Design a protein around this ligand. Structure first.
Ligand SMILES: CN(c1nc(Cl)nc2c1nnn2[C@@H]1O[C@H](COP(=O)(O)CP(=O)(O)O)[C@@H](O)[C@H]1O)[C@H]1C=Cc2ccccc21
Ligand SMILES: CN(c1nc(Cl)nc2c1nnn2[C@@H]1O[C@H](COP(=O)(O)CP(=O)(O)O)[C@@H](O)[C@H]1O)[C@H]1C=Cc2ccccc21
Ligand SMILES: *[C@@H]1O[C@H](CO)[C@@H](O)[C@H](O)[C@H]1NC(C)=O
Ligand SMILES: *[C@@H]1O[C@H](CO)[C@@H](O)[C@H](O)[C@H]1NC(C)=O
Ligand SMILES: [Ca+2]
Ligand SMILES: [Ca+2]
Ligand SMILES: [Zn+2]
Ligand SMILES: [Zn+2]
Ligand SMILES: [Zn+2]
Ligand SMILES: [Zn+2]
Lengths: 527, 526
């Protein structure tokens, strides 16, 4: 016979428990808001009532994003994922942001669904302490059939989070294969690979892991769609994306963007042996047509009260849209990058006591460190809550002494694989850079002018490779993050500075009204 | 017979009563300071004791420049020019800044030397009131000889100051020639033209006014030197500058820069008929080698106490040199222009209740309205006094609505006669302009991008001729000044804003530490 399975899936929700603006930022105009767990429940329940065979799965990065996680630390994730009745979750990189303890105690011990990762192996005293709290797979009953779900997590988690020294993140394909093999031997013939490594790993898993029928992914915030997409996000492929495997099968690969804006919806048709005959669907845009569930909403409002202490005090006003979108700040000059770098520079010049850094005028900032926009409509108020979503990583803005050559290398690294929405793209201050993307990686920086320090009047002069420059940047960059190894290995001095979010709030309070522009600090040429 | 005269001269002192930094701003490091009336007195007296026949002349613009003029309103000029025992003064355009009563009551009634201009004609009730308080000439005895001094004043004075409608500024040459001829018939064979119209007009006068022996000038802040100059000022020619006149004579033309930094010094050798045989000299740099005279210095300090109210409160700090120099802000982007425009823009966004201008992001500012730098050395303090010398005109920063086409025409006017250190050169905010000076005047702007207002994220888009733009600018520019007639004629709305010096102090008090850069707002291409 035929056997139909509906996979409903979310990924990279990133602490967006409440409904959001179109662009993921705080909801202001309720009529045009989107996502949030209350709306998501309504739609999930609409599908479950109409189709007998449904799994609702999460591909990780529920942790970290808003003051929801700052205050509740994963308890909100356990609680509201339980209310939605998720069948399964793959662990993501952000599930390690409060260490292993911060994963165990709030989420793994409270979740009423299996949490999965087959490539994470525990070692030392931790092995027995966490044994079973997450599994390599789970076999779930769905009607009269069983469906195997096998988990995986990005092996870049040690560089993006705090998983500690007692977890080993194995290569995904190598770890998955014996588990999918195990399940086949246990006559589990339908197998879903659920995990958090990116669209490109997902296609490889689909290609290389024999026995996997569907791949449900995350980490790259990938939007896939078939036909005319319903919002501002531009499709990266069809939904589902069809990989032709190494063993002659057609493996559908799915993802559902980010921030709870869409519920993925894939209908698979299986044969009696568990081969995929076909599949179809699309992500469902969770727009204001779908009501928020009253019960979930009311429960969100109860949890909300403790968060309102982060939104009482207006820090200041923006009269412009502060564009902290992934699609701006990882691809080109973005005015939120500018605001942050100027804030960094401005705040550092107050510390007059420390005379070495008292004329620092140059700044660099990883695009991937800017995590949300802030909207200017409705008086463009800026609260702590709004800032916390732009800067959730609790970092510092540190001061480094760098060679011109080191800095030149950083600017090449910034665009070395340009076009894949990766976070190493640098927003700046006191620096005018020009990239020519038709040139080879490592040779795309064609102009690099920085504010002089030796001069009485600051002006943008060409960077010289044997000169030394003083620069304010996140400690993440200072310690070699986003693969900026040259910064870490080659810097001449590194000083701790102030906490990132205090720096920017301090700027906003001082300025009262802000209005950062896209000024031409980062340009692209063709010559 | 040979008769030697030494002409000592100043022009465009611009209220620099006290000694100053090299760049004309407030003195801070006294070891390196220059100018001031106390130092000038020491050098004048050194020359008077060596040279028997001496005239000390001023070619105008003593008025306006520092808190000396704000507070004492010209009384300081009369007083200290009297103590230096000036022989005569020509009226300059800034001598009319507080109107005719501001000229009459402090300077003309207290000056113990003749004050001169031959091309200013009084008409109506003023004529009898001002009769004899200024003269077209004076005949000064100098030993057993006499020297006639004939005055002139820029006929741009009506566009640059407040002379009123009862004074008529005649063409210089047409006014001077009858006076010089009159003096000849009066047996005055030695004649000095002392006046305030510019080096170019000075040269014309030399060329065309028969009977003039020397021209002593001002207004253009011109530096002449014969040899290796002593400081940053680049000579525009020899001192004296020799004009070969239409009647076959050599006529030396002299100016001495500005800000009391130099005392002009020219020894003329005349024959028995008052024809110049030879002249030689140079401006003397009034640096700290020359001591300040103890008495004039002590008297300055007595007058100084009323001014210390303007320097007691630090407003903030600059960690960069704030380049308000003529030579930067009239020729290229200068960081003081940028400071002032950013203050203009910033301060205006405070006014939240007025919704029409609350996104204004575009500023234009005449370079000539920026009047002094501010130094960053010794913790770069900024006081009202420092600011008062950057912006001594008392204007407002106003809001206009302009067609792109009007603004495009403004930026063409900005560089139409570029290279002559004129004040119409525009400093800017929210504007990226690029000029090609090889192109024809009226066609030199090859790129003009301005911040969008309709957009949600501000970015620099190319200006559109038929779109409309909201711009903050000096009221001087809104009202047509500096030749920007298109602004006055073509603006669609014009609203009064806040007082200029207030705007910039408020911004500095808010910022605490400022660091304006030259960013590429104004660029030159080939
Ligand atoms: C402080 N940390 C960080 N600090 C900043 Cl300042 N920036 C970061 C950070 N870690 N990642 N990033 C930036 O985000 C990009 C990836 O985003 P996505 O491509 O969207 C996939 P994701 O959704 O899993 O984060 C990267 O390239 C970066 O540009 C990390 C590093 C250690 C750690 C320990 C505990 C907690 C957080 C952290
Ligand atoms: C407010 N007013 C002004 N406001 C600004 Cl905001 N700027 C000005 C002004 N008048 N002139 N300028 C600028 O100065 C330039 C010449 O300098 P110089 O070439 O150095 C020869 P000077 O030394 O005689 O002034 C020009 O081009 C301009 O760029 C003038 C206009 C009427 C009036 C009445 C009473 C008092 C002052 C004023
Ligand atoms: C939600 O999306 C559908 C199509 O995807 C559209 O027809 C509907 O108008 C949308 N609702 C809004 C904008 O509230
Ligand atoms: C004053 O000027 C002369 C050159 O004109 C120079 O020899 C002397 O040392 C100067 N004094 C200074 C800079 O103190
Ligand atoms: Ca199968
Ligand atoms: Ca003669
Ligand atoms: Zn994520
Ligand atoms: Zn992730
Ligand atoms: Zn002058
Ligand atoms: Zn003048």
């Amino acid at each position: 016979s035929m056997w139909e399975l509906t996979i409903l899936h979310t990924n990279d929700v990133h602490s967006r428990l409440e409904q959001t603006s179109e662009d993921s930022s705080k909801c202001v105009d309720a009529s045009r808001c989107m996502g949030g767990v209350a709306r998501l429940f309504t739609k999930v329940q609409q599908i479950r009532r109409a189709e007998p065979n449904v799994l609702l799965l999460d591909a990780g990065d529920q942790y970290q994003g808003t003051i929801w996680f700052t205050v509740y630390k994963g308890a909100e994730v356990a609680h509201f994922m339980n209310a939605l009745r998720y069948d399964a979750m793959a662990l993501g990189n952000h599930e390690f942001d409060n260490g292993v303890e911060g994963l165990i105690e709030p989420l793994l011990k409270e979740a009423k669904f299996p949490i999965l990762s087959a490539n994470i192996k525990a070692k030392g005293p931790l092995a027995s302490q966490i044994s079973g709290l997450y599994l390599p797979y789970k076999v779930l009953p769905v009607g009269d059939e069983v469906v195997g779900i096998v988990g995986y997590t990005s092996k870049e988690t040690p560089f993006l989070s705090n998983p500690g020294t007692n977890l080993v993140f194995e290569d995904e394909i190598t770890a998955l294969q014996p588990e999918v093999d195990k399940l086949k031997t246990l006559n589990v013939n339908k197998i879903i690979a659920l995990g958090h490594s990116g669209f490109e790993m997902d296609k490889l898993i689909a290609q290389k892991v024999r026995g996997v029928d569907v791949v449900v992914g995350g980490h790259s915030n990938t939007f896939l769609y078939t036909g005319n997409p319903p919002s501002k996000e531009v499709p990266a492929g069809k939904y589902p994306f069809i990989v032709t495997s190494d063993d002659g099968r057609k493996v559908p690969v799915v993802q559902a963007y980010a921030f709870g804006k869409y519920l993925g919806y894939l209908k698979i048709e299986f044969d009696e042996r568990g081969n995929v005959i076909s599949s179809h669907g699309n992500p469902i845009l969770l727009n204001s047509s779908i009501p928020e569930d009253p019960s979930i909403k009311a429960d969100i409002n109860k949890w909300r009260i403790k968060l309102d202490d982060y939104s009482t005090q207006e820090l200041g006003k923006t009269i412009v849209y502060l564009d902290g979108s992934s699609q701006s700040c990882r691809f080109r000059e973005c005015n939120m990058g500018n605001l942050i770098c100027d804030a960094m520079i401005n705040n550092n010049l107050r510390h007059t006591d420390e005379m070495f850094w008292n004329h620092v005028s140059m700044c660099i900032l990883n695009g991937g460190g800017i995590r949300s926009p802030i909207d200017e409509r409705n008086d463009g108020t800026i609260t702590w809550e709004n800032l916390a979503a732009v800067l959730p990583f609790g970092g510092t803005f540190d001061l480094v002494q760098l060679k011109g050559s080191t800095l030149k290398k950083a600017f090449e690294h910034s665009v070395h694989r340009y076009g894949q929405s990766t976070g190493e793209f640098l927003q700046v201050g006191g620096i005018h850079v020009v990239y020519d993307l038709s040139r080879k990686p490592g040779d795309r920086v064609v102009k690099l002018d920085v504010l002089c320090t030796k001069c009485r009047v600051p002006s943008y002069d060409p960077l010289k490779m044997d000169e030394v420059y003083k620069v304010i940047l996140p400690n993440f960059l200072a310690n070699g993050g986003d693969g900026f190894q040259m910064i870490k290995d080659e810097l001449l001095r590194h000083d701790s500075g102030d906490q990132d979010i205090n720096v920017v709030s301090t700027y906003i309070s001082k300025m009262k009204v802000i209005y950062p522009a896209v000024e031409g600090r980062i340009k692209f040429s063709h010559h």
